[PDB]
DNA sequence: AAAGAT
DNA sequence: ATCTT
DNA sequence: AAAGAT
DNA sequence: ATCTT
């Protein structure tokens, strides 16, 4: 399918080549610098080319947003099924220690699920998927050598601020959590767990339309939650009393 | 001065190279994307040479945050003075005209010694914004070699650059909303270069930023704008 | 602009 | 967009 | 974690 | 970190 091609070739193109700096029109390059500022950047980078040469081989089309804070990072159709879009997002974190549980942070519970046309490139119900590439990698402290500029000829003695990327494509509500991601910035916060857990869709939800009922009506501080619910089983009690 | 070679510098470095995409060890190139983000990450990554360049020139040591969402970019100090460091921050803003940087929090280490800072707010002497405006600008999802560098298309043109202080081009109009950060005055490249701005000096600006309040209705019963806060001090700050 | 989006 | 305390 | 930082 | 509505 799309999705097994697609997965099939990012773990592929991962194990294979690493990203190692920024290069200009000159042929100089830069190196990269420590935060998830820099490797969300860079994985998304990455990721572009791959996700459009298998969305092209199976026949959609790929559009990313023409406008700036409108999710998705990628959307994916066929001409002929407006309605059956493919939201792509890709969401990155990193380890300390190589494999202990990470959590990512799945974007706003206050957009496009609660309007239609929110921050989104097309409406919400054209879509019938949504899909999150996540990318892991282990932190690794930046070097007095990271700070000079090099030429293609020393390409592979660029030091990397990081290590050990492993990456997963999964459903959103399968990974979805039952925690906010963020405060100020409300986000949906996905599970916290191991990257195997990611992979298998260990989550917490059991369905899509639970994972959705569940984040349309959380409130947005503890406080304005704090007669409704503040975690799964609260809401499933919540839900089995009558939504009060 | 270190300041004015890191302005020669800077503007030198902008002139002769331009970004164009990332590369692998193995010598693949993926360009740019039009995300706010990519061009964010873009021109700190470019800046980090040249300013540990001109820092050593002049005996500075160069440390970058070693913890994640703390200010500054960059903090330089020579190891004679520690008490006397310098803070370099890198923004960005686009164009298609007048132009406004989010300056960073006005909540964190303006108000707090050492909240989201590398080291003691009271530690620097100076406090630098590096800003980079650039002008936004298709099937550029695939990959390059070394010898199509000059074929790949970029999502930005015209690239101007100035450092100037922090206070300089500080406004008196919040920047953004839920992540209450320092807004710059709205204003042409030109002004910023010169430092045309609305603060009479740099004890005004922090004394302004840190008696903001953070929403309209807290403000409108104190001040919106300089001229009410000038008000508002006058009243005896209240 | 103020408020709230990625 | 994701992180710290 | 929640709340508020970059 | 900075953008949109
Ligand atoms: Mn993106
Ligand atoms: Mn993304
Ligand atoms: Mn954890
Ligand atoms: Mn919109
Ligand atoms: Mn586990
Ligand atoms: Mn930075
Ligand atoms: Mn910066
Ligand atoms: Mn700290
Ligand atoms: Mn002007």
């Known amino acids: 399918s799309l999705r097994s091609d697609l997965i099939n070739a990012l773990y592929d193109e991962n194990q294979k080549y690493d990203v190692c700096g920024i290069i200009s029109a000159e042929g100089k390059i830069y190196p990269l610098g420590s935060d998830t500022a820099v490797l969300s950047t860079i994985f998304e980078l990455f990721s572009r080319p791959i996700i459009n040469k298998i969305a092209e081989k199976h026949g959609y089309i790929v559009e990313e947003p023409k406008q700036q804070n409108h999710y998705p990072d990628f959307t994916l159709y066929k001409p002929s099924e407006p309605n059956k879009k493919i939201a792509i997002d890709i969401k990155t974190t990193y380890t300390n220690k190589e494999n202990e549980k990470i959590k990512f942070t799945l974007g706003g519970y206050t957009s496009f699920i609660r309007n239609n046309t929110k921050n989104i490139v097309y409406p919400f119900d054209q879509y019938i998927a949504h899909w999150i590439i996540g990318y892991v990698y282990t932190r690794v402290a930046t070097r007095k050598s990271s700070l000079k500029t090099y030429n293609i000829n020393e390409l592979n003695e660029i030091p990397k601020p990081y290590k050990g990327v492993k990456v997963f494509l ?75």
């Open 170 to 244: 999964q459903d959103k509500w399968v990974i979805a959590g039952d925690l906010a991601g963020s405060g100020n910035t409300t986000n949906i916060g996905s599970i916290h767990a191991h990257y195997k857990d990611f992979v298998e869709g260990k989550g917490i939800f059991d369905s899509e339309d639970e994972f959705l009922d569940y984040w349309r009506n959380y409130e947005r501080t503890s406080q304005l939650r704090n007669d409704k619910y503040n975690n799964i089983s609260e809401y499933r009690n919540w839900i089995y009393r009558g939504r009060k």
